[PDB]
Amino acid sequence: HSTAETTLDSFFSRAGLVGEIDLPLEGTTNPNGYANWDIDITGYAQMRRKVELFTYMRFDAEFTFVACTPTGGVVPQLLQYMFVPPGAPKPDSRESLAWQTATNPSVFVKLSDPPAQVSVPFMSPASAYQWFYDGYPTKDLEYGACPNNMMGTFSVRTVGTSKSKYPLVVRIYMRMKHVRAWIPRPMRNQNYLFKANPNYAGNSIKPTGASRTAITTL
């Protein structure tokens, strides 16, 4: 019965899959053996609903990178995951001098080696992130969108001058730690429409939960 499983850190812990990069040898998606992933903790489906229980949050995260082949095979390919601190520019080519700039923390690891993990501190220049922003950050509709909440950008890529020899799939897991929440708000009860705002189906409004026949009949 220990009320410890109901804390905030015990509610928001656990490494969840938030990203899945894909470097097919040949095809459409990521045709340059590299891709840019913007840290988005909603990469985990049911996470949005959860964090959105509060108005202000603060936390750190431990990202883990489980990469393999689509088959699930291990291969002797060396990778480089780079981190783009919100504010610095991201790579655009397979050798944009971006991967070169030190102020962009990179971490080389082979697929042979166990998953790579690193910790991103609470970025935001604010006191805390905030899932809601009732205004405009002083043409276009810039409502509800809160600026400084950007945690950064991970840029995965196969080390080396030439393309990779095998197809690769990098899965990105992130567990948030040391959490502080504020201003609890009602629990979402209408399906989500966009990752952006809280819009909902303006006719397809369903009841918070299942319904019955008569109020007297159980």
Binding site: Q46, Y192, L193
Partner: protein, 46 residues
């Protein structure tokens, strides 16, 4: 179960029908064990 102990009584001039709101909540001694992320409301890519 809620029952009508007496009939509803009102004077001439008042609404001959009212409503009752219900407010629940658990007491101090409440516990919760094991986490389950069951959530039908999920995040969708625009």
């Amino acid at each position: 179960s809620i029952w009508y102990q007496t009939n509803y009584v009102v004077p001439i001039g008042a609404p001959n029908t009212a409503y009752i709101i219900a407010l629940a909540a658990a007491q101090k001694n409440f516990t919760m064990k094991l986490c389950k992320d069951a959530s039908d409301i999920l995040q969708t890519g625009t």
